[model samples]
Target: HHHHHMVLADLGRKITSALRSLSNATIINEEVLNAMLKEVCTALLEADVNIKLVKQLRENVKSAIDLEEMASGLNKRKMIQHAVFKELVKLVDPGVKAWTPTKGKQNVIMFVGLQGSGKTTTCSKLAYYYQRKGWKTCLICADTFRAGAFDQLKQNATKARIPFYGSYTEMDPVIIASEGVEKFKNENFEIIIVDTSGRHKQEDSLFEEMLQVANAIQPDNIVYVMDASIGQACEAQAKAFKDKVDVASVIVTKLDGHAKGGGALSAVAATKSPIIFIGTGEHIDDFEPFKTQPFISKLLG
Candidate 1:
């Protein structure tokens, strides 16, 4: 069920093969380096990385590995590998600091994404993640759009032994969200997560409703959840959401099953928001913090 394994493995193979061509050469030259970079660029594009970022990465690597100006004793292979590694990290990083919850304070985390993007599941995973760390966490199902959204949240919250708030009669998500947040804050809950509705598309109505909920609750952090299987489409969707809200962080889900996961890089690029967590499996414990270097190492190899 390692969705990204094959795609990343293929990418790593192609990149390493390209770099290997320069390994046994007597002297590194511009022509050989350019050819190698071309291969690397093609591989990244095939793996669903954005063309703009790939081109920028290639140019950055080329500038770093100035073959003609080298002192002749430096290990060109190591230099090339190091440059690629650094550029890849830079490509995925949004250059923003991640938002963190403060202890003993009521931290309201809001989750938003399109329908079937795994937003609901990721909400449970997030609540459980914080709960395991000894935080007094709770969940609020403001997702009145989906028919069974509250039921799903209730099930997950009950299994995790965490309290949750949702309304069966309330028709307004903004009211539900605000009331839930107020209740939890009064109860001294440290972490209050608001799971918002997921629409079928990024339409104006969706944005309007989200803005209403966000304004009503005044969430401390707005986290966007993205589906890893969407490939290059992630960028546009992520940008649309970020443009309408103060998206502070991102979480890519469905990475454990047959998803390319390359679009995650594009999502970060589009939103300029750091990826805080990645959902790797179906279980609540499957969610893990996103580490830049390890992710690049796995991506390249």
Candidate 2:
């Protein structure tokens, strides 16, 4: 099965081995700390965590610990690992603020994904998210290639009681996007989210359309929506979108209850773009900010 590659288990195994080394030693000295730090740092790098974050963790842990006053004990392993827990959050926390759409400005935000990656629904979720916050938000169905895409957008907009723009006869998505964004911006809308079409696979023509829509509307943020369940393939797909445009952030989906976040972590490393939000369910309101807690409990437990 494709699920055989348990990357989370691999990460824990490597970390536990380093922690277990403390049990075999008589003295918890400088060498022990140094060696253990090396092991943890190496494991994080191979785990698709960014190298800069890995180094920062080591440096932070090194300064907070003093091996001279430390001695051997059964809890020594716990001591060292708990020290790691402090900086563990930092490695997962990329050095970027969350995407905050300024209140006064008209923010043109675009959504990108493969066909089944739940991008259309995510656009509505984010629109509803902003709507509840008192932000003047609307959706633009630039996804003309998808049959009935406008109808779906129209339904979601009406359900949320928010305004939306689309054209049933529109053949060129670029023209629709340009026209939609122009109307919304002119109307002083605060959040203008554009839902684009997707293909079965990463296609050249799709990227070509992406560039076209990007230039025509010039979105303030480009979000890559992906399923967290897609493990090893996440890196390449994220980077493919990143290379095509300035991917402002990633939105991890399908994290309702059970999902290993190895793919999400790798997507950040591959794109150097912070994860802005997460889709927890199929409904519009089941969305939340992707903070540090979810993966922390899974990895550090």
Candidate 3:
């Protein structure tokens, strides 16, 4: 679950608690709607929702409640309050943006991040996900330069029963990525995930290598994987990667650990990139899609 998902659960419980006051009441009025929307907006802003999006969403809720009263043939108060909540849900809901593998061509995904950011684990999980979804997925152990990194990914790939392409001696990240794509092409794989070596902040060589890999693969999505524990550095890390490649999405891992995962939101809001996946726990299935509504709802709870 993403941090937003946890936030949504919190939000829902909080809102439901407030709604209890209206229970056994006749109808909802403007006062109740206003108060609820205010609380919800505050929760969202505190949770790192974009300032502009928050203002617009709050205004939309207010205007919606005034113009289209949902109080027909029922308790007016309850009806109006419900409408406001529904509107909020729609406002923050990360729209349906699920990934569908490209047709007649392989969808390349390049993973970039700093060491200890869980890049390799995320790559394996992604491949596992795609494989389970019936897509022919292959992993490229392109991070061979890092000690043990190559074997770690290769082992995971084997465990998942997915094919991989790479060798420990392939010191050239670009060539590793290119060879991975070629192997995918030969095998008719639908998705190819290249796990590049993790770079530290401001590591010129690592950053340059990532850039080279991007150039070689021309991946459809260059994902910036981050440790959920990463705090304000999220902004810097994301900017570093974004400057190197066209990052399509983000995946925040280690959420179930000590990470509050708040900094990742700062990065996401800054980049205007959607979070495609979240590693909630150590188990494979613990990872999930980023759904903003349920996430915010949890936050309010």
- Models 1 onward score TM values of 0.91, 0.74, 0.77
Higher-TM-score candidate of 1 and 2? 1
lDDT of 1 at 155: 93
lDDT of 1 by residue, 28-107 (tens): 77887788889888877877787887888898997887776776678877788788879878877777778899997889
How well does candidate 3 score on lDDT at residue 79? 58
Total clashing residue pairs per candidate? Answer: 1, 0, 26
Best by TM-score: 1
Q: Which segments of model 1 are wrong by more than 4 Å?
A: 2-7, 144-146, 256-260
Q: List the residue pairs that clash in candidate 2.
A: none
> How would you encode candidate 3's per-residue C-alpha lDDT over 75-153 as one tens digit per residue?
6555546665665555533343535467667788888877878888888888888888888888987756455778888
TM accuracy, model 2 = 0.74
Error of model 2, residue 198, in angstroms: 2.0
What's the distance in Å from true for residue 124, model 1? 0.5
- Model 3 worst lDDT run, 10 consecutive residues: 255-264
